[PDB]
């Protein structure tokens, strides 16, 4: 029941359409660039048809590049990802559209299209199951980039795990072990494969660099690698969108590795903001390390420093990312100092994918290898077959898995009231991996956040509502961020309570009364601790607490 729309090389369009009868759920609607094909992309999106939802795994263009184009032909109803993926998609779509206007290629979608994609853009974080058109959808972290998820869709005809891109051990800002469904996985759609050296050549260039990174993941991991090792010389970020992504991962640090959920980059990262500071740092002859994101030396800011760095016989150029075909970066890496680092790789190797399949609870019925290069997909598929699991490659491309519901109780004692065969029963809806109703005799056969009491939460929210610090708008926004999930509400409450060091203002509503600063700050800390203790509670309990003060949501 799943169609791989261009799921071989991901160029000129790629998509995973899981049609389940009542829903045309769509996964990984993105574009890969090779660097006239746009018409074939257009024909493929018109070939997709009406999709009820455009699930998004991660914020790269491979999975998120055709979302406003599906909005343009109006084929998608709802677009859901993580909030980190949503704002990184904002930066991606704006930069991609600016690149389409700069290169004079006919624009695929429009800026208004990007906006109207964000009209219908819902968001949830990990481990938040949503019941959409009898499909239960859950997100899990797969350690690729920030906000990157693997999708777990339970339909009545089976459980599908769209893995997306899987992270490696060398990813420092995230947990290494990718989160998995705790239940049965029937079909697993897996995408195949495709540090001290950097520091020591930074010594042999500085005391005697230029680093081309990628703005999502790669530049922030180079920055964090330089943050852990404090050497002697300084680091500069000469990249606008890389600086915005760095600031957002500082904002979205609750979505990161658990150790890094407590600043993060411990200062000392002078970021160049405008192009005049860029020309200054290009003409600066001081020994310093310049990390910046253009990609493969083809367009961006890097090119302000390239000339200065290129002719310099003391400088070096540190390729921490893959260089694709027909790019200036590839033309300088092959030869037509030069160092290439292979540890800075967001994509997992083959053995990490074997680890990913092996720590499933059950062995999947069929592993659908989709993207990656051909020969690596071939050898990976052979190693899946050596683990006795079925493989369907997209070039080569069937039981039926029905999740039945059984009554398991007596139905003889039934009556009629309104031409209905109704009977009252008290039982237990046990849920195996075959929802089962079972009577009470079966049950007898079987049988970071602070913490506050419920009455203290009630009295503190009532006090701060009378003091006007907590508001109906505040409770409504907190309920929206809490229905998003716990971590999004943690980020919202931390963002409200955080005191701006330049101005001394918190985003809390000011108290109404004759309170002196100290009392105002103690009331703000009371609101912070009270709503974190509310965050620790259950969702229905939070709804029953917040419906007293704000009658709607």
């Amino acid at each position: 029941m799943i169609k791989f729309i261009g799921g071989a090389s991901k160029v000129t369009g790629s998509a995973f359409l899981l049609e389940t009868g009542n829903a045309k759920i769509l996964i990984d609607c993105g574009i890969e660039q090779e660097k006239d094909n746009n018409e074939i992309i257009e024909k493929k999106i018109n070939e997709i048809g009406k999709a009820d939802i455009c699930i998004l795994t991660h914020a790269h263009l491979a999975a998120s590049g055709l979302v406003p184009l599906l909005v343009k032909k109006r084929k998608v109803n709802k677009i859901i990802s993580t909030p980190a993926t949503k704002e990184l998609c904002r930066l991606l779509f704006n930069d991609f559209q600016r690149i389409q206007e700069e290169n004079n290629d006919i624009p695929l979608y429009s800026y208004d299209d990007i906006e109207s994609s964000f009209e219908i853009w819902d968001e949830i974080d990990d481990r938040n199951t949503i019941e959409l058109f009898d499909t239960k959808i859950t997100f899990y972290n797969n350690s690729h980039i920030i906000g990157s998820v693997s999708v777990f869709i339970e339909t009545h005809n089976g459980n599908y795990l769209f893995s997306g891109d899987i992270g490696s051990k060398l990813q420092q800002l995230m947990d290494y072990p990718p989160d998995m469904p705790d239940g049965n996985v029937d079909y697993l759609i897996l995408e195949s494969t495709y540090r001290d050296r950097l520091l020591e050549i930074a010594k042999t260039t500085c005391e005697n660099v230029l680093i081309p990174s990628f703005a999502i993941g790669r530049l922030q991991e180079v920055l964090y690698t330089f943050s852990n090792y404090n050497f002697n010389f300084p680091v500069y970020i000469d990249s606008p969108m890389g600086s915005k992504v760095t600031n957002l991962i500082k904002e979205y640090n609750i979505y990161l590795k658990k150790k890094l959920r407590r600043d993060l980059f411990n200062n000392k990262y002078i970021a160049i903001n405008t192009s005049n500071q860029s020309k200054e740092l290009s003409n600066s002859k001081e020994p310093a390390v310049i990390i910046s994101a253009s990609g493969m030396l083809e367009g961006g800011r890097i090119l302000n420093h390239l000339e200065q760095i290129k002719n310099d016989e003391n400088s070096t150029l540190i390729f921490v990312g893959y260089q694709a075909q027909n790019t200036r970066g590839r033309k300088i890496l092959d030869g037509e100092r030069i160092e290439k680092l292979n540890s800075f790789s967001a994509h997992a190797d083959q053995d990490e994918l074997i680890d990913y399949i092996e720590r499933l609870k059950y062995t999947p019925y069929k592993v659908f290898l989709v993207h990656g290069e051909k020969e690596q997909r071939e050898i990976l598929a052979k190693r899946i077959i050596s683990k006795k699991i079925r493989v369907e490659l997209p070039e080569n491309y069937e039981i039926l898995i029905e999740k039945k519901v059984v009554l398991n109780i007596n139905t003889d004692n039934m009556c009629n009231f309104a031409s209905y065969r109704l009977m009252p029963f008290s039982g237990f809806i046990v849920e195996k991996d075959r929802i089962e109703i079972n009577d009470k005799n079966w049950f007898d056969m079987i049988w970071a956040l602070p913490d506050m009491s419920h009455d203290k939460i009630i009295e503190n929210i009532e006090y701060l509502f009378n003091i006007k610090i907590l508001s109906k708008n505040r409770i409504k926004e907190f309920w929206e961020e809490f229905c998003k999930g716990q971590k999004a509400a943690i980020k919202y409450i931390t963002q409200v309570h955080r005191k701006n060091p330049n101005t001394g203002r918190r985003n809390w509503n000011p108290p109404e009364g004759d309170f002196t600063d100290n009392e105002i700050e103690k009331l703000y800390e009371t609101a912070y601790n009270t709503l974190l203790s509310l965050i620790k509670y259950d969702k229905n309990k939070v709804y029953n607490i917040l419906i007293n003060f704000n009658p709607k949501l």
Binding site: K50, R74, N77, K78, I120
Partner: protein
């Protein structure tokens, strides 16, 4: 007869558009979120009544021209059966030749229907006295219908087109006084044979 007239009518919405929900269960399920729901399908599209708008338009213009056209808008009024609109849309004796469809949209509710907020500004004090949220259909939304005339005459396409220009002038449904429902129409008719499907 041996020929039938098919008028494919395409509507592009130019102003905001509202047509209120008529199903009591769906309206009562929507009053916990919006005070004015849009008349919507169970397949999540938007339908607009279209026969009454065309009949009202044609009756107003033909009464203005001076023709002997009845007013079936008065309370429990009966059509006489001799008017041109009685021949087209219907009478109590015989059914009408024109079979007007609902205006089903080409897009689903999550793509064309938005939830908006209207107020009641007090004349002095300039404050929000009342505030109500209502659903509406955006501008640029495309609706489709097929008007099916069983026994075509020479003046059936012309009167339908004149009624469509009157609906463009005055609005199709809902809050026509506040500026809602100002739309535009494309017409592609074709006289099809009645025995077409037999083959």
């Amino acid at each position: 007869a041996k020929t039938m007239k098919k008028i494919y009518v395409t509507m592009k919405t130019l102003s905001p558009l509202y047509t209120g929900e008529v199903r009591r269960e769906d309206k009562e399920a929507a009053q916990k979120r919006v005070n004015f729901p849009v008349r919507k399908t169970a397949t999540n599209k938007v339908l607009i009544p279209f026969k009454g708008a065309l009949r009202s338009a044609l009756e107003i213009m033909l009464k203005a021209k001076g023709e002997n056209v009845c007013d079936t808008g008065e309370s429990r009024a009966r059509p006489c059966g001799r008017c041109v609109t009685c021949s087209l849309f219907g009478s109590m004796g015989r059914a009408g030749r024109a079979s007007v469809d609902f205006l089903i949209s080409n897009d689903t509710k999550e793509q064309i229907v938005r939830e908006s907020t209207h107020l009641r500004i007090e004349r002095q004090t300039k404050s929000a006295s009342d505030t109500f949220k209502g659903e509406e259909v955006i501008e640029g939304a495309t609706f489709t219908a097929t008007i099916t005339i069983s026994n075509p005459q020479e003046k059936d396409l012309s009167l339908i087109q004149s009624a469509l220009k009157f609906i463009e002038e005055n609005g199709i449904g809902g809050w026509l006084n506040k500026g809602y429902g100002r739309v535009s129409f494309e017409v592609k008719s074709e006289d099809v044979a009645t025995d077409r499907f037999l083959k």
